């Protein structure tokens, strides 16, 4: 189905506390597979999935890590530049710490071929500049971003992101997807169970738990005799278990005696048909 390769770059100036720190991680869908930190003593790109520590890497590209290392040092160095210029652009003082984030990558259609390219930036947490899916044109979010747009259009930088995306990005996404088949393409269904928690004489909380699933995408809902009550239910954000699987709970406070009128609804990629369940 729809798969994505994403890199996430964060640089943070630390006025007084030394030069900027660069961090980079790479993901395929919800699975991290590489990291880099410019504070590490002898800083290299490091595998962070098992399937990135298998011999296939050597044969596909014997220099894989040295290359990602090289790129990440460049990326780090450029952002040390950016943080000075953006200071300038926004006429900001020397003492404040500021943040530059880049997220770039590709999505695939279910055909296999490129669906969408991404290359987008934020400054101090807010939209700055982003490449349109024409892969020629930028959206600058403000007057400082306009300087950047004019610069990169005049210079024809979009072309380079286009060739990376059209060549490398899709190619490696497919490589990682095929090489990591058993972890990435093998979806784990959620294991759901309902728990009963008396929380007064007027309401006993019925909580629907969904656990050990991959990927993170999931819909948890409570229905009351066919009536979805998403507006009257408590539902946490999906959370990482710590073992590559995710967790989520939805809870409704019902009057005691009405337990069997509710039905928990679980929909998930790895489930054949949707789960429906209630108190024991």
């Amino acid at each position: 189905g729809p798969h994505s390769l994403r890199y996430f770059y964060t640089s943070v100036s630390r006025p007084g506390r030394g030069e900027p720190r660069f961090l980079a991680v790479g993901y395929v869908d919800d699975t991290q597979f590489v990291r880099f930190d410019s504070d590490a003593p002898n800083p290299k790109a490091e595998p962070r999935a098992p399937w990135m520590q298998q011999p296939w890497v050597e044969q596909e590209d014997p220099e894989y890590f040295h290359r990602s290392t090289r790129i990440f040092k460049g990326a780090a160095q450029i952002d040390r530049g950016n943080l000075q210029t953006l200071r300038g652009y926004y006429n900001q003082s020397e003492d404040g710490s500021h943040t530059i984030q880049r997220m770039f990558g590709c999505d695939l259609g279910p055909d296999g071929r490129l669906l969408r390219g991404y290359n987008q930036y934020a400054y101090d947490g807010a939209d700055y500049i982003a490449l349109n899916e024409d892969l020629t044109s930028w959206t600058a979010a403000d007057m400082a971003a306009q300087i950047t747009k004019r610069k990169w259009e005049a210079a024809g930088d979009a072309e380079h992101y286009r060739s990376y995306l059209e060549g490398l990005c899709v190619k490696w996404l497919q490589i990682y997807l095929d090489k990591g088949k058993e972890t990435l393409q093998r979806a784990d269904p959620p294991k759901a169970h309902v728990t009963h928690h008396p929380v007064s004489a007027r309401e006993v909380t019925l909580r629907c738990w969904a656990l050990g699933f991959y990927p993170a995408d999931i819909s948890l809902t409570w229905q009351r005799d066919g009536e979805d009550q998403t507006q009257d239910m408590e539902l946490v954000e999906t959370r990482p278990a710590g073992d590559g699987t995710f967790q989520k709970w939805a809870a409704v406070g019902v009057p005691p005696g009405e337990e069997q009128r509710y039905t928990c609804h679980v929909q998930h990629e790895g489930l054949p048909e949707p789960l429906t369940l209630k108190w024991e």
Partner: peptide, 9 residues
């Protein structure tokens, strides 16, 4: 595989 931007902003 990563990619670094040609120029700064």
């Amino acid at each position: 595989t990563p990619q670094s931007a040609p120029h700064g902003v």
